[PDB]
Amino acid sequence: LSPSDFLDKLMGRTSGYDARIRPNFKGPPVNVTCNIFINSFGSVTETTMDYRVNIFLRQQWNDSRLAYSEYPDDSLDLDPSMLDSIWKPDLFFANEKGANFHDVTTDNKLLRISKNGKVLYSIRLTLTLSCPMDLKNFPMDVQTCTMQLESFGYTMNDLIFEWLSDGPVQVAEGLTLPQFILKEEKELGYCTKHYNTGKFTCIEVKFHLERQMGYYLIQMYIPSLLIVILSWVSFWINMDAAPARVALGITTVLTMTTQSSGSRASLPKVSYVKAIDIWMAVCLLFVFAALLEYAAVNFVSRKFVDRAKRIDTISRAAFPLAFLIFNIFYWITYKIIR
Amino acid sequence: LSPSDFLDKLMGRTSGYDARIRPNFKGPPVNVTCNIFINSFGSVTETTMDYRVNIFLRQQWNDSRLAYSEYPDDSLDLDPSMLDSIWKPDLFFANEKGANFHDVTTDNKLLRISKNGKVLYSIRLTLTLSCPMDLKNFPMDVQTCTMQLESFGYTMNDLIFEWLSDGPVQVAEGLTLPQFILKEEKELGYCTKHYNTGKFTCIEVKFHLERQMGYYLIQMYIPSLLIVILSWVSFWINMDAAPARVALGITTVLTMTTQSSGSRASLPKVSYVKAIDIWMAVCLLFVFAALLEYAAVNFVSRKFVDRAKRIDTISRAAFPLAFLIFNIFYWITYKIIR
Amino acid sequence: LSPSDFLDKLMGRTSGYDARIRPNFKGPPVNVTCNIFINSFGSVTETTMDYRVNIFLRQQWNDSRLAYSEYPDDSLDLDPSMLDSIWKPDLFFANEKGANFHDVTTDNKLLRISKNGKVLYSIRLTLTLSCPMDLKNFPMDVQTCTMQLESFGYTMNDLIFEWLSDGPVQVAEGLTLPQFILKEEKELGYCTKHYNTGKFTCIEVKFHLERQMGYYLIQMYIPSLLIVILSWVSFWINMDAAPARVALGITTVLTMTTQSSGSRASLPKVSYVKAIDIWMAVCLLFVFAALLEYAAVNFVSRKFVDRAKRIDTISRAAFPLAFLIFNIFYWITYKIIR
Amino acid sequence: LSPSDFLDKLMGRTSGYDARIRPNFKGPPVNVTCNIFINSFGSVTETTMDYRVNIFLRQQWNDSRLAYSEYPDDSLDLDPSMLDSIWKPDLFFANEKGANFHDVTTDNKLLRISKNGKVLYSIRLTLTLSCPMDLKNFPMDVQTCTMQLESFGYTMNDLIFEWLSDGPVQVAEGLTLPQFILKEEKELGYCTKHYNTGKFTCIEVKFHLERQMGYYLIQMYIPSLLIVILSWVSFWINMDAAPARVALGITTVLTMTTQSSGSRASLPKVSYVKAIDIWMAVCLLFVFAALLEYAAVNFVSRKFVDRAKRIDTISRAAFPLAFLIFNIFYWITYKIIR
Amino acid sequence: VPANSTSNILNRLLVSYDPRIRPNFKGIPVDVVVNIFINSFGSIQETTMDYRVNIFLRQKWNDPRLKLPSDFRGSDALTVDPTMYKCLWKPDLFFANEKSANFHDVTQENILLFIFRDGDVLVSMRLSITLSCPLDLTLFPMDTQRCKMQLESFGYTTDDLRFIWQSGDPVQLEKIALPQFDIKKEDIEYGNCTKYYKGTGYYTCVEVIFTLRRQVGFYMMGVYAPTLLIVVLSWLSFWINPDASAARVPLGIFSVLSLASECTTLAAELPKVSYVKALDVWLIACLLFGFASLVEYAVVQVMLNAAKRIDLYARALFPFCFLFFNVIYWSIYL
């Protein structure tokens, strides 16, 4: 009746249990029920195209070799120490760059056994997973970052993963990311990797991540706008103020270049065009057209100053309208219809 | 009488002790009285929202099976290498991002055993715990960081955590942070994680940190203030010497933009607005407005020079008072709150 | 007949199978066929001159004393635990900097057996391999990054690795490199290293990575061109507005120098000159040339204004011509290689 | 007879072998012959004063017990897994900071045994060694990176390391370095450490690194020289064309101080002077003196115009000559040394 | 048989020698003599307030159970395979002002072991430890830091264990040389601290304290003299006549621009500290001096609407006050 003798009979040395032998050997495959609980979510670095998660992974599976009646308790708590004696199914995260355990004062595990053998195995992991990104519309991007639970040694003919029915993927009440806002609607599916060695089972949970514009807004768009307003003040100037108008235009151009360098430098290296780049280059071309408009009026000057002031007023009344058109088109095409 | 046979009879091989079984199996739960001794504190980083500590964690409990009546000495210290045969409770930190031990010349550990059976297990640890910071008022913030001593594999029905009555959390005499002011008001609260499996205990300790703004002040605020007074003295120049004002405005605005870029670089990306960001942006705005007023002066002045000098004098005499009222409101509303 | 006794009679305590002794001892070598699956590819930092891969090495070989007749099924999968108890060939990557396995919930490795004696061993790995770069044409380069598999402690007389004939190197469907682009053609070969000990076998794959000019172009080339045109603007201004052109040229020079320094220092330290160096240096020269043109027209004038404006307009109408000629020459000499 | 019973009768639990001792205990010491084969070479950074190498170290020695007579062969190859059962001479690199084995598919080792007991033990090791660097002449230096081998628990009375007569140190064909030029003059020697505990034996090999100056040429020296040769044009210009000369001087000084700050802060922190710093300071001072000369001309020319033009021509014909003589001494004193 | 019977009858499961039980159990304490050897020293990253030392720690003590009878009569010492250092009792030692440490295992565990006849045991273990020493950066280029290393015990109280240094030559090092600092091998003060932790008892701790002096070479070469020449140039502008007065303004701008860039660089290069540093003192000094030159130009501009007289007073006052400031500054922060 003693616990030590009972465990020894169940799975210890004196038991007769074998670990390398999955349940139902040379028979039907296993049906594993996997869930998780997310605790820490962040380190979303577009540089490495990765994100960090700390998860209380949980796997349930039934092995008929663990079924008793001595201890009438339906469930049972064990010590992670001898856990390695039982058959714990192979598993990995095909989209992990570097993974780690957590070993602090004991092995972070939970081995809960029922009266029939419905083993439950909890394991606390940290994962630097990878999710490729499509930044065609970067600041307003809706990124889909995945986690793939997938077997490695045992094939689908012997090991079959599948999610839980109620609350398969959870999160910690009070979870907020600096930049993004994690959605409550996660997508669940199978991926079913099929290599040449055989058909390996697999899972896929996709988290949708919406990027809060706040930072890029209060840091890039608002400056660029103020700079364009300064350039329009420059538009609204006489012709004989060469130094002042030129100083204003060049200040605008240079601060625009600084903001563009910042934007393009806080990001990874890619081959396509980013929205922030579109906006920054458009404002840069606006201010450059202001400078070139001053140059044109100065060339026309040396009646001609009449037509010069005419084109000056025309530009003053037009370029605000062109910037309004660009603003409206841009915002409706990125933030409204997408 | 012998020490080695005594240990082997108490908690070794010949003993009837099983290191995988809490006392009172399927009985009342054991209540561990944890406590801390922080040896250092630092590496606080607002980038990854974490800090770092190295601590002599301790936890003491009671197990009757370790009662010895041979050694009359009440207490007793043992070799750390014996822990591999004793029941040390499972314990992890929830907000942990990365932890480790420190095994230099021995795996730093301590086991003490009283006569009635009371046990004390102490261990040195180093941990990069996570502290989500609310940077609404960044340079003057009061960040509330947490440490959650949590359990794993032992429900609240079998394992309970509780602080020590007197002086649970201690500190070292020469404990000082580079840019923070730690407080002796450390909050002790219950955390009581409730997962789907069961009710797991969790004990939180909260540190109230106050950032000291010496560095930020002398590195950003003071240079920006100097550049703004520079853009001010740009007014005391004569209009006919437009190159002076041109060069001064350009030199001021470019430096202001570069310093704002450096500021944002020293900080992470975040949706809400940061105080220092407000101040940097408004100083850039005052530079913009001063250069714009010079431009409007040149516009009005091709009498006209009379109005130009009038507005320039009004500016040179009032703009400082506007900066002053803004600064007093800013400091009085972002200093007395934090 | 339980599978425990089966594995015991096959490779366990019984069977006289000593993993220390390779098959065909004092006989012919062990012809290993090793193929690869590439799950991820990236972190190709030019500064470190290396590249990171997460691969699934799956090598097989036909040894003896592992065949059987108990299970009529041709194929067979075992528990990865026994993988360490049998002979695993000794191989390494002769161009690796830092390599590791991936153990999460189990040591990620696969063992498969057949009835004829064949064996398959597939061990996930992450390798930070080394690749030498010839950056003489940096933004347009086709790098031949090589991965070498070789042996250690087993000569070509006892262990030779020969690639698989059909589909030896594979890649994931949804693979995406941010900067470079990967080809579907890999170059397989033998390097057959010869040390002072004996002859060690070797096999090498060469991936052709072709760089995308997107980011480098949108970040350096386009702003450099816009700044160069900003400088060119100095020729349209009136000659009497000396301060305007002065400030313009000075700002152009300073910003171009900053951009060049940044872009150059972001790259590694190398003697061989790069094309980006050529471009930034010639743009620097062109800005300096506009400034020097202004200086020389001042030197000419102070009816000399006629000759001054003549040289000024000659510059304004010629410098862009030379810039465009040089641009087409540069692109046809650096881009045709592809 | 059989390889299993053979390796049992030899250096196995059935044999009288004792791996906890050296050969001929209480007798003469061992004459260990060491030799290393290099594979890679890099990470040479003056910041940490280190350099990285991955080497196939090799130690040959004598162990009379392993001599056998069952096989006709003279040399035999064994399994690395048996290495841990034979003697091994303690060995470390006294000038290391971080060092590691490589574990990929195995523990990368090699263990040959000749019929005369001559053992050959080879091990792959990656080493971040340290090199005290003397930067008296930084851009053109001849460093003396060292590698030391020495025991730690066996003294000269028992263990004696020795190089190999022929081909003790090799380098893999095709090896190239980014901005260094490895020399084939690798000078060997004995360091013979003498501690307060014994007379430890030792070996050392000194490589000669000849730095490349192409990067520093095309990034610092050539830009500085071009900037100075540009500034010189200001002298040829009349004292009336102020804006030209002032713009030239000011932009030259600004770009020169930018180059100085960059190329001075991108270096380690050393008290002693450096050739590159001498050159940067001297060019900065040349352009500074050009500016101060224009200032002195302005002051003189409040006849005076005659003295102004005389000083102008003197400067125009001297400063190039001053730079020529200084450059001559610089190159002919910092190149003749190597 | 030769020397294995020795090793076994001395310490193994074959003989009754328990590695877990300290010597002189329930008797006197254990006096653990100590002496260090420092092989490499540096990586002082003020950004983290730490320094790295690669050393050959050495500690000896007594253990009567490890006595060598005439069974070994060839020498007074004895060296065993380091692999058995884990089989005999060891003193539970650690470093308190430690952030991250590690052994050095390359071709073997770099451990050394000596045994004598009187029972005197000696053990050494190469170690690369990254200690921490809080910096007092008030005198930045002339900081006389005192970076420490306090070896503590753990598990054993002062009633059983007790550390003490070696009489002569306790901390050795050979041909040391650093890029920034200059250790004073004589000013190597060390002594007791004897931690006391509530709840457990008294723990022993012995500390070494190296006095590190920083070389002002790099800063005197890279910032101080440049800024000095900048402020000197600022004075030359006064000579220019106010009539044109179109380049004196950018000259004063160079006196502000360059100085601010230098301050920003040297600030982003050093750690974050509230207390002001002599470096920033000198920087803001030269900054305000250039600023004063520029505002004096502004005044003479407004004075032109006798200005040359103001320039005279400027040439008279600027250098005098600047040189008094430089004198007091050097006399303070020497």
Ligand SMILES: *[C@@H]1O[C@H](CO)[C@@H](O)[C@H](O)[C@H]1NC(C)=O
């Ligand atoms: C596992 O699940 C599959 C379908 O999901 C089923 O066909 C099979 O019988 C199951 N095996 C068990 C429960 O052992």
Ligand SMILES: *[C@@H]1O[C@H](CO)[C@@H](O)[C@H](O)[C@H]1NC(C)=O
């Ligand atoms: C696992 O255990 C048994 C089947 O052997 C059954 O009672 C239980 O429902 C199974 N759970 C599954 C298949 O999810």
Ligand SMILES: *[C@@H]1O[C@H](CO)[C@@H](O)[C@H](O)[C@H]1NC(C)=O
């Ligand atoms: C822990 O506290 C509970 C309170 O419900 C008590 O029943 C139990 O006896 C305590 N533990 C011990 C070891 O007494």
Ligand SMILES: *[C@@H]1O[C@H](CO)[C@@H](O)[C@H](O)[C@H]1NC(C)=O
């Ligand atoms: C353990 O139980 C004893 C009673 O035998 C009690 O005195 C002691 O306080 C308990 N330990 C705790 C509560 O930590």
Ligand SMILES: *[C@@H]1O[C@H](CO)[C@@H](O)[C@H](O)[C@H]1NC(C)=O
């Ligand atoms: C292995 O292949 C070689 C050809 O490279 C051949 O000579 C040898 O006989 C083969 N051995 C086996 C066992 O297949």
Ligand SMILES: *[C@@H]1O[C@H](CO)[C@@H](O)[C@H](O)[C@H]1NC(C)=O
């Ligand atoms: C595979 O096995 C067959 C027969 O057992 C043998 O002839 C052959 O050499 C082995 N190796 C390969 C690569 O086929």
Ligand SMILES: *[C@@H]1O[C@H](CO)[C@@H](O)[C@H](O)[C@H]1NC(C)=O
């Ligand atoms: C090793 O070298 C020493 C000194 O050169 C010599 O005395 C000794 O005899 C040598 N050992 C052997 C094996 O002879």
Ligand SMILES: *[C@@H]1O[C@H](CO)[C@@H](O)[C@H](O)[C@H]1NC(C)=O
């Ligand atoms: C090893 O021993 C042999 C004797 O068989 C001797 O000839 C040789 O010089 C020795 N060399 C070394 C390195 O021990």
Ligand SMILES: *[C@@H]1O[C@H](CO)[C@@H](O)[C@H](O)[C@H]1NC(C)=O
């Ligand atoms: C070290 O100093 C402490 C100071 O209280 C003292 O108690 C202790 O005995 C000293 N250690 C010795 C003398 O070995």
